[PDB]
Design a protein around this ligand. Sequence first.
Ligand code: HEM
Length: 246
Amino acid sequence: NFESIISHMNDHHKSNLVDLCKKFGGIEQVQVFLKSVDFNGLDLVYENLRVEFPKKADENTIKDTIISLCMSAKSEQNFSGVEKELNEFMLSFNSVALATLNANGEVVCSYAPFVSTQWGNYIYISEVSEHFNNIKVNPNNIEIMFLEDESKAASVILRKRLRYRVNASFLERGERFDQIYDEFEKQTGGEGGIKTIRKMLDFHLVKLEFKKGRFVKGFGQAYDIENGNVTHVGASGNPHKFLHKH
Ligand code: HEM
């Protein structure tokens, strides 16, 4: 079963088993081979290093999980096909998590419906909610998070996420409201009481202005955003601290 890849990995690219020790062990210098694999990860030697898989594989997937485990350990960010992946990610949602602050400096964690359009990014919120006055009062101390669903994530310790600091502006109704909200209805498909809250006057559309961003798509895969300024963290070394000690 596995001995065919154990062979192939050991007779070709231990150069990638080398990048592997340096990132799942932190080992800044050695001079490697593969001794066993299973459906939860690898066992290798530089000297035992146990390297886990983001998600448990099976006979059909195991070949690919290992190449993915290797390409991420590669010390070179790929194309900003991460810019493309970041935006594909944002567009899969029509709701977002919010961090807001009230009149007396207490922080609030809430969520709000969200839509990206030609005219910009909006949320739709009611004055009945705490985060409303937190935004009327502190309109540029907000951060929003697009957080991957737990049931879709590799594990609860690796939910993909996209975070922006934002600047919020209140729109009023009429011309654009109907433009934005009809696009919101387009993306969401319309139903669920979405039509009903459109006609609630205690609800408002708020334009969000994205500032500094942060995207995490996997272990060792955190990126920053500014002004086309995608950026891996990160190259100044593995920031974590292992014992290498039992
Ligand atoms: C065994 C490999 C790794 C594992 C299992 C791992 C796991 C994690 C986890 C669970 C977090 C979230 C911590 C939190 O939210 O409090 C995190 C954060 C982070 N890690 Fe790693 N990591 C690994 C390797 C690396 C490497 C190689 C780098 C640098 C290239 C790195 C850089 C970072 C950065 C920059 C963050 C902050 C992300 C954020 O703002 O949420 N990690 N890591």
